[PDB]
Design an enzyme around this catalytic site. Sequence first.
Site, PDB file in Angstrom:
ATOM      1  N   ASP A  76       0.830  -1.205   0.000  1.00 41.53           N
ATOM      2  CA  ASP A  76       0.000   0.000   0.000  1.00 41.53           C
ATOM      3  C   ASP A  76       0.866   1.258   0.000  1.00 41.53           C
ATOM      4  O   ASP A  76       1.346   1.695   1.050  1.00 41.53           O
ATOM      5  CB  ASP A  76      -0.930  -0.019   1.203  1.00 41.53           C
ATOM      6  CG  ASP A  76      -1.961   1.077   1.153  1.00 41.53           C
ATOM      7  OD1 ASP A  76      -1.910   1.899   0.212  1.00 41.53           O
ATOM      8  OD2 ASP A  76      -2.823   1.110   2.052  1.00 41.53           O
ATOM      9  N   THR A  77       1.021   1.866  -1.178  1.00 37.32           N
ATOM     10  CA  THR A  77       1.766   3.113  -1.301  1.00 37.32           C
ATOM     11  C   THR A  77       1.072   4.280  -0.612  1.00 37.32           C
ATOM     12  O   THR A  77       1.713   5.309  -0.369  1.00 37.32           O
ATOM     13  CB  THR A  77       1.975   3.451  -2.778  1.00 37.32           C
ATOM     14  OG1 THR A  77       0.701   3.606  -3.420  1.00 37.32           O
ATOM     15  CG2 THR A  77       2.763   2.352  -3.473  1.00 37.32           C
ATOM     16  N   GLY A  78      -0.215   4.153  -0.301  1.00 36.33           N
ATOM     17  CA  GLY A  78      -0.937   5.197   0.388  1.00 36.33           C
ATOM     18  C   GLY A  78      -0.826   5.160   1.892  1.00 36.33           C
ATOM     19  O   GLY A  78      -1.285   6.091   2.556  1.00 36.33           O
TER      20      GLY A  78
HETATM   21  C1  LIG Z   1      -4.954   8.954   4.200  1.00 36.19           C
HETATM   22  C2  LIG Z   1      -4.420   8.107   3.043  1.00 36.19           C
HETATM   23  C3  LIG Z   1      -5.047   6.713   3.029  1.00 36.19           C
HETATM   24  C4  LIG Z   1      -6.572   6.808   3.092  1.00 36.19           C
HETATM   25  C5  LIG Z   1      -4.513   5.939   4.229  1.00 36.19           C
HETATM   26  N1  LIG Z   1      -4.934   4.549   4.204  1.00 36.19           N
HETATM   27  C6  LIG Z   1      -4.296   3.640   3.269  1.00 36.19           C
HETATM   28  C7  LIG Z   1      -5.256   3.323   2.124  1.00 36.19           C
HETATM   29  O1  LIG Z   1      -4.574   2.619   1.126  1.00 36.19           O
HETATM   30  C8  LIG Z   1      -6.437   2.490   2.612  1.00 36.19           C
HETATM   31  C9  LIG Z   1      -6.019   1.077   3.013  1.00 36.19           C
HETATM   32  C10 LIG Z   1      -7.273   0.271   3.339  1.00 36.19           C
HETATM   33  C11 LIG Z   1      -7.773  -0.796   2.372  1.00 36.19           C
HETATM   34  C12 LIG Z   1      -9.030  -1.595   2.699  1.00 36.19           C
HETATM   35  C13 LIG Z   1      -9.790  -1.330   3.994  1.00 36.19           C
HETATM   36  C14 LIG Z   1      -9.294  -0.263   4.962  1.00 36.19           C
HETATM   37  C15 LIG Z   1      -8.034   0.537   4.634  1.00 36.19           C
HETATM   38  N2  LIG Z   1      -7.343   2.342   1.493  1.00 36.19           N
HETATM   39  C16 LIG Z   1      -8.632   2.984   1.448  1.00 36.19           C
HETATM   40  O2  LIG Z   1      -9.062   3.601   2.374  1.00 36.19           O
HETATM   41  O3  LIG Z   1      -9.321   2.831   0.246  1.00 36.19           O
HETATM   42  C17 LIG Z   1     -10.776   3.188   0.196  1.00 36.19           C
HETATM   43  C18 LIG Z   1     -11.002   3.713  -0.938  1.00 36.19           C
HETATM   44  O4  LIG Z   1     -11.043   2.431  -1.957  1.00 36.19           O
HETATM   45  C19 LIG Z   1     -11.604   1.467  -1.305  1.00 36.19           C
HETATM   46  O5  LIG Z   1     -10.716   0.170  -1.319  1.00 36.19           O
HETATM   47  C20 LIG Z   1     -10.172   0.078  -0.124  1.00 36.19           C
HETATM   48  C21 LIG Z   1     -11.145   0.900   0.884  1.00 36.19           C
HETATM   49  C22 LIG Z   1     -11.659   1.911   0.167  1.00 36.19           C
HETATM   50  S1  LIG Z   1      -5.280   3.911   5.744  1.00 36.19           S
HETATM   51  O6  LIG Z   1      -5.742   2.523   5.660  1.00 36.19           O
HETATM   52  O7  LIG Z   1      -6.385   4.616   6.391  1.00 36.19           O
HETATM   53  C23 LIG Z   1      -3.744   4.016   6.677  1.00 36.19           C
HETATM   54  C24 LIG Z   1      -3.375   5.294   7.409  1.00 36.19           C
HETATM   55  C25 LIG Z   1      -2.066   5.362   8.175  1.00 36.19           C
HETATM   56  C26 LIG Z   1      -1.139   4.154   8.194  1.00 36.19           C
HETATM   57  N3  LIG Z   1       0.103   4.208   8.919  1.00 36.19           N
HETATM   58  C27 LIG Z   1      -1.514   2.882   7.454  1.00 36.19           C
HETATM   59  C28 LIG Z   1      -2.818   2.811   6.686  1.00 36.19           C
END
Ligand SMILES: CC[C@H](C)CN(C[C@@H](O)[C@H](Cc1ccccc1)NC(=O)O[C@H]1CO[C@H]2OCC[C@H]21)S(=O)(=O)c1ccc(N)cc1
Lengths: 99, 99
Positions: free
Chosen positions: B25-27
């Site tokens: 996860d690059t995000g």
């Molecule tokens: C603030 C940037 C971004 C939102 C941060 N997130 C990583 C992100 O990749 C999450 C990672 C993530 C993936 C799946 C469930 C919960 C979190 N993905 C996400 O929220 O995606 C949403 C939008 O598309 C949909 O597919 C996935 C959920 C929906 S996170 O999960 O909240 C996160 C925040 C801080 C840390 N240290 C590790 C992870």
Amino acid sequence: PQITLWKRPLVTIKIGGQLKEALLDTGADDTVLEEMNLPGRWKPKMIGGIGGFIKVRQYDQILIEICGHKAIGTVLVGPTPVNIIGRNLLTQIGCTLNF
Amino acid sequence: PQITLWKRPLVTIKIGGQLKEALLDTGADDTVLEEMNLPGRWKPKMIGGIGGFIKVRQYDQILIEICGHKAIGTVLVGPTPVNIIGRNLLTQIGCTLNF
Ligand SMILES: CC[C@H](C)CN(C[C@@H](O)[C@H](Cc1ccccc1)NC(=O)O[C@H]1CO[C@H]2OCC[C@H]21)S(=O)(=O)c1ccc(N)cc1
């Protein structure tokens, strides 16, 4: 380009004729942008992240250029902490992970 | 290798002697893993994303193997719906975004 990950992979995007900064987010299925005005029809949807679910506005077939590469797809608009570009658009610009 | 983004970039990791599936996860700034009983000291932390924040336990200098690539750094543990490999460890395995 090749993007290393010692910093957040932030890039300039163009949507609705406006420039913004967005995070390339391989952990997001979908693309979610902060509150903004977009023309055309939209429908209400829900999306879940690490902290729970939010209400968003779903825009379909939206033109959006990411770091010089064009895409046309679904854009969700709502109270996300940051603009995130998810896999639905990363695939369209030919983005892969490499190690 | 090269990983396309048609589907979630899930890979096998080894941590605390356990094999798990985790999202590259690059995000994600930092790695966060589903609840597990790691030994050692830790510090409380809160991390925010879509939906709000969750409380996690921060462990430091934890060894993780990601697709046969060894890394060591911070691992957060808490009620995440998915195991997430963040940039703090993706850099250590030489992972890049390319398009
Ligand atoms: C603030 C940037 C971004 C939102 C941060 N997130 C990583 C992100 O990749 C999450 C990672 C993530 C993936 C799946 C469930 C919960 C979190 N993905 C996400 O929220 O995606 C949403 C939008 O598309 C949909 O597919 C996935 C959920 C929906 S996170 O999960 O909240 C996160 C925040 C801080 C840390 N240290 C590790 C992870």
